[PDB]
Design a protein around this ligand. Structure first.
Ligand SMILES: Cn1ccc(C(=O)NC[C@@H]2CCCO2)n1
Length: 152
């Protein structure tokens, strides 16, 4: 039938929120109070792909926008971008692989592994107001763990 989706926000494990600074830019910063209205709301779709008890394939679109997180090669490294799509055709159950993330439950948080690029994860920096990016380890100094808030 039709792909199922949920509206949500994400916070990294240092409790930074995500905000849209540009058509193709997401940043992470500490936020509280009225300024939380600035956070990005995602539509998380539950898409086709390999699934296990703790690992579920999803796509992450911006709520009511034809923009999705996707993973592509840039300068011979997996990179994260926002990509526009035809709004008549998305979301769909069979999302192209570059749009798919394995949502992994680990230690009461979530990680988002690229389905296209194994062991590359949606990441944030510890510094304030830096771009979200794809980080090719869950060990060192990038933040790869998140919590989800489910939104009306
Ligand atoms: C205009 N600008 C400067 C830096 C960036 C950037 O890194 N964009 C990518 C991130 C990953 C997902 C969307 O934003 N864009």
């Amino acid at each position: 039938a039709p792909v199922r989706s949920l509206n949500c926000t994400l916070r990294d494990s240092q409790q930074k929120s995500l905000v849209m600074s540009g058509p193709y830019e997401l940043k992470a910063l500490h936020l509280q109070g009225q300024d939380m209205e600035q956070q990005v709301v995602f539509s998380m779709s539950f898409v086709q792909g390999e699934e296990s008890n703790d690992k579920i394939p999803v796509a992450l679109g911006l709520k009511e926008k034809n923009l999705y997180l996707s993973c592509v090669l840039k300068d011979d490294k997996p990179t994260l971008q926002l990509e526009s799509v035809d709004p008549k055709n998305y979301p769909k159950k069979k999302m192209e692989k570059r749009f798919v993330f394995n949502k992994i439950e680990i230690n009461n948080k979530l990680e988002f592994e690229s389905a296209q690029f194994p062991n590359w994860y949606i990441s944030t920096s510890q510094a304030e107001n830096m771009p979200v990016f794809l980080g090719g380890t869950k060990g060192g100094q990038d933040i790869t763990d998140f919590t989800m808030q489910f939104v009306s």
